[PDB]
Every structure is written in structure tokens, then in C-alpha cells.
Amino acid sequence: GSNSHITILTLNINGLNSAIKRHRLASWIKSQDPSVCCIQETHLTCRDTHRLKIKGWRKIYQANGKQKKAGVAILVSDKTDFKPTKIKRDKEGHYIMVKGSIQQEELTILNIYAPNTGAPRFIKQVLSDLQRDLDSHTLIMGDFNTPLSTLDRSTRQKVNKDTQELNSALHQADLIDIYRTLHPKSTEYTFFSAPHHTYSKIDHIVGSKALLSKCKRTEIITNYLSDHSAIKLELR
Numbered sequence: 012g013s014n015s016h017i018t019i020l021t022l023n024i025n026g027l028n029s030a031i032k033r034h035r036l037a038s039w040i041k042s043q044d045p046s047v048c049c050i051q052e053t054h055l056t057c058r059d060t061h062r063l064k065i066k067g068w069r070k071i072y073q074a075n076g077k078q079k080k081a082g083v084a085i086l087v088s089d090k091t092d093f094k095p096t097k098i099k100r101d102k103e104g105h106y107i108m109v110k111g112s113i114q115q116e117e118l119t120i121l122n123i124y125a126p127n128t129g130a131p132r133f134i135k136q137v138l139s140d141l142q143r144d145l146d147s148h149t150l151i152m153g154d155f156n157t158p159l160s161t162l163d164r165s166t167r168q169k170v171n172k173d174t175q176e177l178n179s180a181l182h183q184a185d186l187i188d189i190y191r192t193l194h195p196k197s198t199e200y201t202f203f204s205a206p207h208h209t210y211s212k213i214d215h216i217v218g219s220k221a222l223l224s225k226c227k228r229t230e231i232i233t234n235y236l237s238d239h240s241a242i243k244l245e246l247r
């Protein structure tokens with residue numbers, strides 16, 4: 012039935028330098044119809060950001076480096092009135108935060124692409140740097156390049172000390188893994204590693220514990236676009 016929920020989607024797209032990949036992405040976004048879309052690994056340089064244009068999604072905020080490497084973007088649908096108050100872009104293109112409100116209701120979105128190496132330490136550092144901005148209306152999403160619990164890997168291997176430290180930091184900031192909270196017994200994955208034939212959930216949606224009761228539904232979406240599956244959160 013008709014309602015005022017928003018949907019926030021996160022996808023690591025694995026590059027957007029070829030025109031067709033941009034149209035395939037535009038088609039997929041059009042079909043998913045997210046209020047807000049967090050994309051990682053655009054691989055667009057700070058010179059080439061204007062290449063990313065998606066009909067229906069005219070408001071776009073990007074953080075990019077100088078190389079065809081990393082690159083993150085937050086796209087807001089034309090049907091969504093997100094009045095921003097603050098946009099903080101990583102100079103190296105690994106995260107972007109936008110803060111603002113929809114419907115008089117405040118919302119802080121942090122889109123992160125952690126490096127393959129040192130990911131859990133990287134994410135903890137970003138949280139600390141942004142501590143004053145990450146309030147009780149926060150969603151953090153993206154490709155953390157790490158599991159957060161044992162169920163996030165097919166190996167069932169315990170998570171390392173740096174990941175344990177990351178989880179402590181999340182808890183100190185009143186943040187929780189929304190997907191794992193809604194689906195505690197889930198053994199779904201977003202990424203397949205062919206070298207070891209293993210599967211992992213390295214893409215996450217984390218948020219303020221205060222937003223828990225607003226989190227209606229969250230799901231993983233397989234796709235032909237990328238080597239990562241998307242995740243979608245429906246928020247009251």
C-alpha cells in the first residue's frame with residue numbers, strides 16, 4: 012500500500028569508465044528505484060565526475076581521487092527532497108558523507124569503500140575523524156572489505172583483532188550492524204573469492220541503534236553488473 016518509506020541501496024559497481032556500464036547501471040537503478048543510492052568503486056577521477064549522469068537521479072555527490080581507482084557516489088532520486096546541510100568528501104575517494112533532512116527528518120549517510128588492505132583499521136579511523144558528525148540518525152554503508160561476525164564468511168573463521176576493535180568502536184558510537192540485527196542467522200553473501208572458493212558478506216549496512224525501530228526490511232540483490240551483490244534497506 013501507498014506509504015512514505017525511503018529505500019537506500021548500496022552497490023560496489025566495479026568501475027564506470029565505459030559508457031555502456033554507465034547505461035547498464037542507469038537501467039538497473041531505474042528498475043530498483045531507490046530513494047538514495049550509495050555506489051562504490053566508480054573509478055572515476057576528479058576530472059571525470061561529470062560522466063556520471065543518471066536520468067531520474069540528478070542530485071549526485073561524489074568523492075574521487077586523481078586516478079581510475081576508488082571513487083564513491085551518493086545519488087538521490089528526483090522524487091526525494093533531501094536538503095543537504097553538509098557534504099564531506101574524502102580527498103582520496105574512499106568515502107563521502109552527506110547530512111541533511113527528508114520530510115523534516117534528519118538523516119546522515121556515510122558511503123565507504125575501504126581498501127583491500129588494512130580495512131578494519133581504516134574504517135575505525137574514518138569513524139573517529141567523523142565522530143562529531145555521526146549522530147543518532149546515521150547510516151553507514153558500503154564495501155567494508157571485511158566481515159563483521161563469523162556468519163559473514165563461509166569459512167566460519169573468527170574475526171581478527173582489528174575487526175574486534177572496529178566492532179568495539181561501532182558500539183561506543185551507538186551503531187549496530189542493521190542487516191545482522193534483522194537477520195541474525197543469515198548465511199547470505201555479497202562476494203565470492205575464486206582463489207579459495209569462499210564466500211563472504213563484506214558489504215554492510217550499519218546504523219544508529221536509535222534508527223532500529225524504523226528499519227522495516229533489508230535484502231541482498233544479486234546482479235549482472237558487478238562482482239558484488241547490492242544491499243537494500245527500507246526505512247520508515
Ligand SMILES: O=S([O-])[O-]
Pocket residue numbers: 070071095
Ligand atoms: O544538488 S545540491 O544538493 O547541491
